[PDB]
Amino acid sequence: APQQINDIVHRTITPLIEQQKIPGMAVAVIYQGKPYYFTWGYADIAKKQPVTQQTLFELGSVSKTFTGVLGGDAIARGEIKLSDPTTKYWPELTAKQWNGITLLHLATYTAGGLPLQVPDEVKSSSDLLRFYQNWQPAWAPGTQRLYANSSIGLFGALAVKPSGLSFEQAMQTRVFQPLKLNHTWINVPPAEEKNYAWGYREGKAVHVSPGALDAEAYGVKSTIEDMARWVQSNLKPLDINEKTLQQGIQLAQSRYWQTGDMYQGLGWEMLDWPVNPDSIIALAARPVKAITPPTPAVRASWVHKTGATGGFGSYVAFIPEKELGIVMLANKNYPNPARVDAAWQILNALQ
């Protein structure tokens, strides 16, 4: 832990924890390709359990990066094509609004207005089909971006259909295991419960609730160590031995659409580096310009993903061209601006 990294990290995170009243936090900085860990506070306030490098945190929306890479891997395997109509994988989706909506639109939130959340009412596979059949797009496909769990969630569920594997089995065997993310789970096993941090919302300990397509959109839990490893894998995909996976990682970081200064990948979001911090709301509908054809992963990019659950807030960002990256996991959902400002403060300093 070079003193410079210790210094920038502690000087940035200590005040953050104090201002945001965060009970527990873990950070990993990947510098010149190697990880450095830092931990503060509590994983469980009541039982006085501290945050350690083995504490599991709910990644919330950061889970989408895993879904995007798993989708990229299925593409790489030839199991699906992003240009394929959604109906090719869900024939029961006969409603006419689906004509022209492809797996690319689902993966990138450009299907035409799918909702941020699947309604809680949807439980069964039957209610889900009914939800998508009855959904009425406000816009034609590929014209506007509206971040949506019901959009990338459907993408994740359909991308694994050809494999015959459940989404969780596919994720475990095709992404977690090959990358040695041995403490990353969609469902936390009883043996690992001792390490599962509690999230805190209004001072109350809470864990994420089950919901339709939760695994695919916001259901992964992981340790600061596994997330540092996930960041290393995304920083340098070429070191990954599994060909299809190496490929999927690259596909998830290609630039499919542009909205202002940001580009939409599969899961990951990117901005050209260098980026102004200030340049990095329940619903923000934004027109998008298609990148035809998609730009392959650009090394000079700030690649990132923010995510939260009712009780946790997380952020991951990295710059391929600098072999630099960071992961910040907390068991309190605090403002996104504060997460990005802290990450930029640290990475700019190490830049």
Ligand X SMILES: *C(=O)[C@H]([C@@H](C)O)[C@H]1CC(SCCNC=N)=C(C(=O)O)N1
Residues of each annotated binding site for a beta-lactam: 61, 117, 147, 149, 308, 333
Q: Where are the beta strands (DSSP E) in the chain?
A: 24-31, 34-44, 49-50, 57-58, 144-145, 199-201, 204-206, 221-222, 255-259, 262-264, 269-272, 286-287, 289-295, 301-309, 312-319, 324-330
Q: Which of 61, 54, 65, 3 shows the shortest CA–CA distance to 31?
A: 3
- Measured distance CA(20)–CA(333) in Å, rounded: 9
Tell the smallest beta-carbon distance from residue 239 to ligand X (Å): 29
Q: Residue 62, exposed/middle/buried by CB under 10 A (0-12, 13-18, 19+)?
A: buried
Pick the catalytic residue from 61, 63, 150, 222: 61
Tell the smallest beta-carbon distance from residue 215 to ligand X (Å): 12
Q: How many CB atoms lie within 10 A of CB 287?
A: 11
By CB under 6 A, tell whether 264 contacts ligand X: no
Q: Pick the closer one to ligand X by CB: 308 or 324.
A: 308
Q: Which helix (H) or strand (E) holds 251?
A: helix 243-252
Binding residue ranges: 61, 117, 147, 149, 308, 333
Tell the smallest beta-carbon distance from residue 314 to ligand X (Å): 7
Tell the smallest beta-carbon distance from residue 115 to ligand X (Å): 10
Q: Pick the closer one to ligand X by CB: 45 or 116.
A: 116
By CB under 6 A, tell whether 87 contacts ligand X: no
Tell the smallest beta-carbon distance from residue 213 to ligand X (Å): 10
Question: If binding means CB under 6 A, how many residues of this protein chain bind ligand X?
Answer: 11
| Identified binder of ligand X from the candidate list 12, 20, 39, 61, rule CB under 6 A | 61
Tell me the per-residue interface mask from 295 to 324 with ligand X, x by CB under 6 A, - otherwise.
-----------xxx----------------
**What phi and psi, each to the nearest 5 degrees, are found at residue 264?**
-100, 125
218 with 208: CB under 8 angstroms? yes
Tell me the per-residue interface mask from 205 to 244 with ligand X, x by CB under 6 A, - otherwise.
------------xx--------------------------
- Whether 61 sits among the annotated catalytic residues: the reply is yes
SS3 state at 86: helix
| Identified binder of ligand X from the candidate list 336, 338, 341, 349, rule CB under 6 A | 336
Residue 282's alpha-carbon distances to 4, 232, 303, 340, in angstroms, are 38, 32, 23, 18
62 with 220: CB under 8 angstroms? yes
Q: Which residues are catalytic?
A: 61
Which residues of the shown chain bind ligand X in the complex (CB under 6 A)? 60-61, 116, 149, 217-218, 306-308, 333, 336
